[PDB]
Paper text:
The cytotoxin ExoU, a 74-kDa broad-specificity phospholipase A2 (PLA2) and lysophospholipase, is the effector protein of this system that is most closely linked to severe disease. Within the bacterium's cytosol, ExoU is bound by its chaperone SpcU, which is thought to facilitate interaction of ExoU with the type III secretion apparatus. Here we describe the 1.92 Å X-ray structure of full-length ExoU in complex with its cognate full-length chaperone SpcU. The ExoU–SpcU structure is the first structure of a full-length type III effector protein in complex with its full-length chaperone.
The structure of ExoU indicates that this domain starts at residue 102 but actually extends to residue 471. Some residues of ExoU previously shown to be essential for PLA2 activity and cytotoxicity, such as the predicted catalytic Ser 142, the “oxyanion hole” (Gly 111, Gly 112, Gly 113), and Gly 286 are spatially adjacent in the structure, thereby explaining the previously observed phenotypes. The structure also demonstrates that Lys 178, which is ubiquitinated in host cells, is solvent exposed and therefore accessible to host ubiquitin ligases. The helices of domain 3 form a left-handed spiral, whereas helices of domain 4 are a helical bundle that interacts with the chaperone-binding and PLA2 domains. SpcU in solution and in the crystal with ExoU forms a dimer, which is similar to dimers of other class IA/IB chaperones.
Numbering used by the authors:
A (entry chain B): 55 to 188, 204 to 320, 349 to 377, 395 to 402, 413 to 426, 447 to 659, 673 to 683
B (entry chain A): 1 to 119
Amino acid sequence: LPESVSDVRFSSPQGQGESRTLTDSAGPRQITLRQFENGVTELQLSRPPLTSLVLSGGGAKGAAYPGAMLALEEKGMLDGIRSMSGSSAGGITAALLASGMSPAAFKTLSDKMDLISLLDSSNKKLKLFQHISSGFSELLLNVLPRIDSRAEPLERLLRDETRKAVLGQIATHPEVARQPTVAAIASRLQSGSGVTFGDLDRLSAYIPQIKTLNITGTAMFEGRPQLVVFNASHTPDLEVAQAAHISGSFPINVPVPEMIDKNFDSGPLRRNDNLILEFEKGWVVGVPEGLEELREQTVVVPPDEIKAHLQERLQERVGEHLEKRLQASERHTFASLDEALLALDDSMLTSVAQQNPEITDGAVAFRQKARDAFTELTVAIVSANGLAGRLKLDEAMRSALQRLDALADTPERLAWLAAELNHADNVDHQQLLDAMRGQTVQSPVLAAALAEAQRRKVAVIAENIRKEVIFPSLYRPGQPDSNVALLRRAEEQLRHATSPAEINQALNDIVDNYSTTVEMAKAWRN
Amino acid sequence: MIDTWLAQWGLRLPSSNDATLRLQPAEGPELVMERLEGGWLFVVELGLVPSGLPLGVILQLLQVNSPFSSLAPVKLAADDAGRLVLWAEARDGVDDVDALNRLHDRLREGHSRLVPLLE
């Protein structure tokens, strides 16, 4: 071997030699930890909770759908579903199920509901395309008020059935029904209003039978498909019946990955599994969820007698899929035991500690101190009554940060603490990060958290550019292969961008080589 | 044989037959090894293809693929995401330790000659 290739190591962790099992199937997630002669630690655990149901497409072919819901109910897994997502016509089904309809009720409705007739009837909802004459997704929303589709049979039906289901769930949970926010929702619905994405989000927190809803469609505008997304974050006050109706009326199948949400986290474990229902070699080397991972989560869907048949078939197929996923496992490899333990959420760590406290004592102490320090920080932030001023933060905040800094004794622990400080739902930590943005700070944990917050901000912008600029041109019918290649490359640049400069380079490469796409690129650049 | 080839560096093929392995020598590029049903795909990454390369550079890159190139049998390609790469295929039962070292050497030689051209 020549000089240059004298020493060689694996660049990612790889177990070497024999391993010992540190913990065997601990807790509900069946956590198994194996450690090798070189310290590399392998984590094996069950698949994550099945919390997302994804309905890819819909229409007439959806006659089999009731069988999938019956299968979920049969296996006691319907209550575990937290969110429903549907693309194009699949939004209709997603909306009904998300509203709390029972599998039995849904089957009855689906069977005597003529979706072909209801969709065909939809009397020209192309007025939308015309009103958009005077990005896109926001223009579409702004024009709905000057459109009247509320009385169209399909929308009236969805509005009535979703409302009935939601009101029924509320009524069966009297402790929930009497809560002021819920009583306000019920009153509004009883007055004739329809269920909104926001209503579902608020109620799902109280009643497991009600789920959050995501409806996505692709709308052809000027020969380019535009991704239109309806959910509690983007359109909280929009009636789900109208969203399902509009989404179902578009003429370009929404890629499944567009319905699976991106989740920033402090570790590598997948937060949850999806059950993807759809009808009927790529080569990326990367730097020094996949379709295959999605395939593992997908079940292909297959006149009264026929309905019964297709439903029976799907129920059998979904039932087997649910049994088989219980036999599957997730695997992760780490360079040290502590990093494997940091990948475990608090409940998982506790489960392992109950079986093998000798391997977790250090990690449990770290976790307890971190949680206590995070609380102290929150107390300091909220009790400060403002994080602005000539002097940076205050003594109480400094003290909390100092405790966190002391816990950051390894690069892995520093990274974990910084990611934990970035949780999007923590209003108080978020106020701290916003308050200190772009400033030099003494706390290494706060400094790392600020850097991570900036990287996340860039990733969010990159994702919007992908959806608004790249997606429409990438999936435009007739797009020459050379442009597709250019666009794929831009997608890669966007996936890896960590600074505004890297985003700008991606935009420049499109402007300089693409043969409105260029216009949108220049728009984002400035 | 791959395990014997790895043994040169005191390494062993990990028992968790994962589809992709990555090697990092003290000097030079990371070597990405992808398992092919009946062999291996050896790859070294050169970054995304830059915009605006001069014709001479484009020619030099394409010339790597000449059947008579000194880098033979290494090939220069771009992956689906536009990442420039040098690759070669190791076929089980045909390429011994010397053959594998030769592929690695050519991949490295190609990498060193080209990276500077991609500013």
